[PDB]
Amino acid sequence: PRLSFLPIEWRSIGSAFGLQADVGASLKLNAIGVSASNITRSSLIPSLKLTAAKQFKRDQKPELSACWTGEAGADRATLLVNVDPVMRSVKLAAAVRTPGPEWRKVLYNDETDLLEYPADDGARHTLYVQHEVRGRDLLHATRLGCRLDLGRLVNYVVDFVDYRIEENIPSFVWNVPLLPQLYSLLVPADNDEQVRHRITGWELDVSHDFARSGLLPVVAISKTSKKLLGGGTLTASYDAAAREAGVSLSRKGVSVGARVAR
Amino acid sequence: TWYRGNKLGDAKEDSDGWEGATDSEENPMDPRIRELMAAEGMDDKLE
Amino acid sequence: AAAAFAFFAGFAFAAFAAAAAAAA
Amino acid sequence: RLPPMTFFVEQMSEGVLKPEGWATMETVAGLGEEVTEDEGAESFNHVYYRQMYELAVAGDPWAQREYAAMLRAYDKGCESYRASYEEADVDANVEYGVESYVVDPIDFGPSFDPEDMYSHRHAYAEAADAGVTVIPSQDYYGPEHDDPLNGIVFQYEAQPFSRHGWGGVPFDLTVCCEKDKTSLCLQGETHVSLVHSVPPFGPRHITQVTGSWEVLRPNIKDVMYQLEVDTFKDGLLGKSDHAGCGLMLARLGEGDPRKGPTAVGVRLQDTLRVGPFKLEACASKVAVQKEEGWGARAFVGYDWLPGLGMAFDFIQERRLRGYGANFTYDWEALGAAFGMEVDYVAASESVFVSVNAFSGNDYRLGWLLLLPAVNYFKETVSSLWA
Amino acid sequence: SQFIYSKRWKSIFSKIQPLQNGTTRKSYQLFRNVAKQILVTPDAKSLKLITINQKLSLKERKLLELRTQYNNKLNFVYSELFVKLIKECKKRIHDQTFLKNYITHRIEKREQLNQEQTLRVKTDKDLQWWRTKQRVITKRKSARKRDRFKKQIAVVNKKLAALSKKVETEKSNLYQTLYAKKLRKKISSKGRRYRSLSLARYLTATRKPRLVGLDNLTKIDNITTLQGAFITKEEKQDSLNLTIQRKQELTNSLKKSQIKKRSRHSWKKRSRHQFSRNHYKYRKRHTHGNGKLRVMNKKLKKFKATNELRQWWWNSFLPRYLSNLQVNNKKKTLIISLKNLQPLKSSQQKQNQIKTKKLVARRIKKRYKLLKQMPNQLMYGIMPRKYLIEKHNIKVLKKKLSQAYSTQQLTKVVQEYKNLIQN
Amino acid sequence: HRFRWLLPVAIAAEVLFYRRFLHPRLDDNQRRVEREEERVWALRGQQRRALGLHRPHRPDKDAAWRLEQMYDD
Amino acid sequence: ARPVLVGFVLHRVLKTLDRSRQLEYRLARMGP
Amino acid sequence: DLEEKPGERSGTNRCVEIVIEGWPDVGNLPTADELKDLLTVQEGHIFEKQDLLDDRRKLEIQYEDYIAEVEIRTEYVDGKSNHQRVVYKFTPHQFRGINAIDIKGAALMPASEVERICNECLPKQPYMVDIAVMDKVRNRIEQWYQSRGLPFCYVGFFDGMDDGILRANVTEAKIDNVSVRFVRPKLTGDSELEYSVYDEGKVVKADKIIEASGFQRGHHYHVEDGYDAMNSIFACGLLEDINIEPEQDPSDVNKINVKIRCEEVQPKSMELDLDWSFQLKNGIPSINRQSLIPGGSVEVSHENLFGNSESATLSLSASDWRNPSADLGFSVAYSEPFYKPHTTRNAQLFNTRKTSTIFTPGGESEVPPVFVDRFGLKGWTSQITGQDNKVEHALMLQLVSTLDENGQVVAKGTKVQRGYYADNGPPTTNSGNGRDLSLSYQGFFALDNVRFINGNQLGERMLFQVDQGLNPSKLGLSGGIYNRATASYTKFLEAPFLPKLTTEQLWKERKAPNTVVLHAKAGNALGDVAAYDYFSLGGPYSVRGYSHGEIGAARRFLELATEVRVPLKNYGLPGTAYGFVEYATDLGSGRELNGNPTEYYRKPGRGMSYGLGLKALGACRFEYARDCNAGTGTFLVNFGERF
Ligand SMILES: O=P(O)(O)O[C@H]1[C@H](OP(=O)(O)O)[C@@H](OP(=O)(O)O)[C@H](OP(=O)(O)O)[C@@H](OP(=O)(O)O)[C@H]1OP(=O)(O)O
Fold first, then answer.
1. What letters, b where the CB count within 10 A reaches 16 and e where it falls short, cover E74-94?
2. Do D231 and C16 touch (CB under 8 A)?
3. Residue H632 CB neighbours (<10 A)
4. Cβ of E73 under 8 Å from any chain D Cβ?
5. Using CA atoms, how far apart are residues H187 and E279, in angstroms rounded to an integer?
6. How wide is the angle at C-alpha A165 spanned by C-alphas A159 and A169, nearest 5°?
7. Total structural domains in chain H?
8. Is F73 part of a structural domain of the chain?
9. Does residue H133 share a domain with residue H109?
10. Among partner residues C2, C9, C16, which is closest to D236 by beta-carbon distance?
11. Residues H167, H179: one domain?
């Protein structure tokens, strides 16, 4: 996820300068540090790349690392590009952080004589998209996840089913007994500009790269609730290929993994 | 008090050939009656 | 076949029942 | 047994068919005022008044009031018709006396037998305008010294199940009976129309049920039964497409209307304007149970040349196929109306051309034509004399 | 750049639950069907989106957005609305009498005024072109020519008797009910749907003066009495009573309504309307001319009336109803087809409406009849003229709000003023 | 042939029946119609005489039988 | 196969989206 | 009325009662109760401001003249109920007061009638103002003038209003400046017409038109005069259409100008039909005179042959041109409408083919039929005198051919019997060649004195048919000399057994009299009578229950019939129940003619039937008839009158 977005120990050091898991040992100013690769036996061994020199004032095989960072409004866009001439392989990573489509609609209050904007902003307001390129003719690893709250997605679909679809639906379907009650439960009536369903803290991350696997996505549901033990993210992961259930309890950057691989 | 100063503050802070009392045109005249009166008015125009 | 095509066209014009109330 | 499949194919692809609709009393149409004829207004009124009644069954004031106004106009109109009939009756009594009016006889054309020799039997007192209409049936070859009128044709039309002249089902029955010492020719035909929806309250969907039975005793010891069910919806694939579908089932039942050979067919019709060409096409396929027949017709009109008329017809039977093309044009010249029809049959490679000319004055055609025809006849007779 | 919805309208629509009850559902369905047929614009995303949508012009919405940025038991509702719509639809468009009044002024009056005065698709279609096409349509039955001489296929298999065909010609047919009892189906007085007035020919008829019924009564066109006047209903009944009391026998008199014999009126049958038969053989047309004009004018008027109804419903009625509910909470004539018409702008609708109002004003203020007798009677007897300052006050408020692009709040300011007038 | 000799007696005995039974009746019925038509016109003349109006212009005898052919009535 | 190729096209759309966000930052977000 | 019943009660603004005040009663306006009926607002029904507003604008135009102003108010019966009462108060337009009414200039109006007018007005009070009475007076005089039939007499103007007397001047218009024009209607298919005008032409004829119109200056116009004027002018018979229109002079109120426009007929008329059948191996067939032959008919006709409206038509159909002799067909028809006072003359050449009842299955199971085809010229005069009396004199020359289905000619008739056919029996034609050319005369005399009294016939009908074949003798026409004569007499008389009944004392009840019908017929033939002219006994007509020719053939025949008809309309059931007994005899016609047709087909020669039947709408009748000799009965249906 976001940890995977920037696993480089050198790019992480570059970010610090601009300001089972082991942090990168990087010291920078106006830089470079060492590749402190994370290791999950009795001890652990890090890697070592001599050419870790990175210089972006304008922001083995030699490398050219240029980072482009532009953030407009609620949308944030980072691009990390590395270019090795001898390898002829380029690693580019672009992430997007935008709320995306909104069910909410601008309203006019006659008494105020002014437009009331849905100024309220979803907390996530992020639709992470992950896509790295190996650098060969056909090497790419995309791990985009539905960062947008599942509740934010459900509201957009429920609003669509209500205003646009219901009118099209025929009446002979409504003739079915007990169907309208279930429909009413499924689709609540909008109150003010507020959401019909107040679901928050639930996220959906899917990992599936065409090069990595033909058809093996890892489904990861994440619950981020402050009330549970004073906060803590409980992520459940189902890897079809490894038959592994990854129950996790990560709080304040803690690393946990109840591997259930079969 | 948001005084509006009484009045004046309520608003903005070939092709085809009134003695009567009406309050507001929101109540319109029956279309059939309108067609009849127009037809007669053309006859009067002819006469 | 011409027979099959004519039968299919008849099935298509049978969409009048779908356009009206259907499966009362 | 069942007639050649060619008969059934031709009957199916008659052309674009428009079904029958409702009929309006007209007393309540304007609530007692002069009205014009519109199909939409009539249909809307039948559904509207039925809907207002339906609502007025519940306690809706505006509905109750609108229905009440219709009843007052309906009662006024009916009483006025009753009074008019009562009056016209007395006036007719004074005009003709106690003697009843006598109708005119039936013309039969020139005969060597004295003119109007039997005219007395064809003149009768006029009936009191009953529902049925009686038409005499005649034969091509009559008896040497008698009238050729055998049997009668009876036609009845109505619209039952209408509450106050609003709604109901358009109906029609036609029976021909020719009982004789040796003959029993009963031929019948019935039509019923069901209207599902109307343009203001939704689409215009209409369904027609037709049932025809033919029985002749001295020739066939069996009865031919036929049914047809058609459904037409305006604008299936367009704004005003007028497309329609239909099914036909004919059985020659032994009487046993069960055990008989059965012919089943399906038809569809569609109209479509594409560019400057307006097209009206109807196709149909019938199978007997087995013989399979295909038939379609297509009328095409061209905007730039309105006068030209183009009809195309194709029949395939199984193997065997055949089509024909007909073109028509009309004009005027020499103070006379001319019409030229050109028919081409590909199966026989024959072209027919037919011109009809009508003149109202000057006999110009006699001078400009028919001179060779007289010459050849004269030569023939003269050659015989030689 | 975005759709702006009314907060008040959205709250009212959200408050109700159309799918709560079956009767509510069916009433909701009815309105949904009728609205979709007329109210809903073809270029409208949804009925639900439009009802709430607060229709604001581009300039007005931009100004409102700029002004904002700068500063910083209702179940029955649908049923009522449905009844209101259908009742309005009857009077506004589907009224036979209203259409009849429109066609008489549209065609007959313009005629009298004229008489007293005297590969590319084709879009300039003309009446003459329509007649030329009509000639082709009248020959459709002969054109089929099925099986050569066989022609029409509508024949019983056993014999040759013809069978009724519900073909395209059925469209030019009108039938009217008159008198499972009674209400017999009959052809309408004017059978042709495309009604057309006759020419000035064959108006005169030959008459035979004859003794009718009781003696002393002679009828050439009307029954007349010995005094020389026309008979009266009471006189007719008195005459019948006298005959019932005087006449004792029947035979010794000539027979009225005597048996008819053929060859009667030979000249009349052969020569009557000879020119009419020849003219038909020349024109080769059905429904004559200008019947299509009458029908087309009816259709065009119905189209304009439906456009006006849509504008009225979505601009005047519904806001006012919702506000009260919320308080509760030269060229030749061109033949044109209907397929090639689009709704007109509101300005054009006002432009024709003012002309209609001008004609109405001419009829009320200046009736000629009234003027003719003015010196002797009813000069200009009282003549009432009523001042309308209150009507001007409502109009003056509308002008101010319209100039301020405050038309959105117009429905509220006018409602308050009207209440204040009643208060 | 006795029947052939009898044939002249027959054609005559039927001419006699025509000439002494049919033609007088035809004349009598036509006379009754003629007198009635004059009476109807006289009654119309009487009615016109009241109110002091000019008598109706009636067709000449040559025109009545010709009109009998053309009567819309 | 064809869905995977559609996914590659979707990835190009995500790159375009990113470019649009960067362009918005360059001019529209240059203001704030 | 349940819908408008007071039983409905609501908490909404529902009208409880309607009050009309200030309604003019002296005027001809519909009674206030009738006006209440016209109002949109109804008792027991809800209303809105729009209702009242529409009613005010409606009532106003409806009247306007008598009523100056309408005021509608809605007082609340009670505040809490919301139930309201609608009061309509009308201010009648009244201008000045008249105490007297006088009429002047109405010369033709009798003095007595005028006196009752002022008495009829009976003004309630000689005060305030009265405008309604003036309209009532105007209507009376005009009504009288119209009922007399003069439509050009009207009240010119009212006067004396200032003096307080309703003086009126009645204008009586008179005819002057009668004129005539001639118009020729051009013929073209344009759905519109252009008329060539020749008013100057036939100026002498126009003077004759004025003479035949009978329009005199200084005589008051009357419509009945124009109907008489139309009858006299039309008698010319040569005019397609005559239009006469009186127009009031614009300047003079007492002058009427009568305009006449007459259009003549156009006799010329030719219709030509053509056909072609071109066959091309490639492209088009090479142009040839043979390929260009139409083979089409020509129908020249003229409608004014001799100026007496004589009509003639010639039709000539050749199947193939360049060879017309093959299947040439010629027809001619001539008629003269005004040949004699009551006689119409005709001469037509026509072809008629019919079956022969002379040869029919009798004792023999099945017999092939014969079709008599007669192509002949008939010239005849028809005369209608009195009422329903017919005299027809026909002289006809016809060639009678006998055809058996496809077979061109049949020498004689045959019965299949056992084996194939049988030896020569009845000779179908005297010539023995199967064909015969005959010249003959026929006379038909019909005396009818039957009247339909309440839908039942009563009276006497006599029919007399006589035909003589004047056929010359060796090397002469083969028709033969023969005389055939038949006579029929039918009497419908009131059932003597029952009382007289009828409408004599039941004129009002319109009861139909019970009737007995007696019928007799006799027919004798002497001479060379051919088989096609043999009298055939049996059929739906004559003796019922037997098919055509079943009874047999008789040179001398006698038919007797009686029938009791009782109309069921008096009983209140539609239809007439008739019981009939019909008899027919051969009068000893055994060995009637060569071949003994009756013996050859084993026909009985004599007959008796009795039947019970019901009449229906029009002439349709359904009966059950039982033959005496056969012992069997069969239901039969037929259209027409048996007698
Ligand atoms: O636009 P077109 O293709 O020429 O069709 C029109 C159209 O009929 P359709 O909608 O069925 O195609 C007219 O009706 P509207 O569209 O105006 O409602 C109709 O006129 P009527 O409805 O009055 O019959 C007219 O037919 P016509 O000219 O005979 O009146 C007919 O044109 P076509 O006859 O050429 O198809």
1. eeebbbebbbbbbbebbebbb
2. yes
3. 9
4. no
5. 6
6. 140
7. 4
8. no
9. yes
10. C16
11. no
